[PDB]
Amino acid sequence: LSEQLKHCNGILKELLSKKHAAYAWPFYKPVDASALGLHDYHDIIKHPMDLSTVKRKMENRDYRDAQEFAADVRLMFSNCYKYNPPDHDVVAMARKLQDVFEFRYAKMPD
């Protein structure tokens, strides 16, 4: 639905909003592995994803349905849970942002 894609865009805007910036910020841009010294990142993560990429895809009308959008958002979180030890600060931030996402995604119009 166009309606469902608008709900997805609303979620995306919320994830990027000041309200959630304290825990969303690591997810704003692609992981710069070389800059961070994470020289194994691209050997472990096959499909990098981040909120700027989700935004560009939405703006370019790449997503054809809500589930395609959701798969990229969940991919972003899964990459974080795969790469980082579960006690890492960034994983705590991911869990909080994923809670924001999942509870609002569940309110999808249908």
Ligand X SMILES: COc1ccc(CCc2nc3cc(-c4c(C)noc4C)ccc3n2C[C@H](C)N2CCOCC2)cc1Cl
- Comparing CA positions, the residue from 84, 70, 87 lying closest to residue 26 is 84
Q: Taking CB under 6 A as the rule, does residue 38 contact ligand X?
A: yes
Q: Taking CB under 6 A as the rule, does residue 26 contact ligand X?
A: yes
Stretch that binds ligand X, among 6-14, 16-24, 27-35, 59-67 (CB under 6 A): 27-35
Q: How many residues of this chain bind ligand X (CB under 6 A)?
A: 11
Find the angle CA(62)-CA(64)-CA(65) to the nearest 5 degrees: 130
- Comparing CA positions, the residue from 62, 67, 79 lying closest to residue 26 is 79
Q: Taking CB under 6 A as the rule, does residue 71 contact ligand X?
A: no
Q: Name the closest residue to ligand X (Cβ).
A: 26
Nearer to ligand X, 3 or 89 (CB): 89
Q: Which two three-digit tokens encode residue 39?
A: 């020289």
Q: Which two three-digit tokens encode residue 24?
A: 């969303």
Q: Which two three-digit tokens encode residue 11?
A: 């979620």
Which positions lie near ligand X, rule CB under 6 A?
Answer: 26-27, 29, 31, 36, 38, 80, 83-84, 89-90
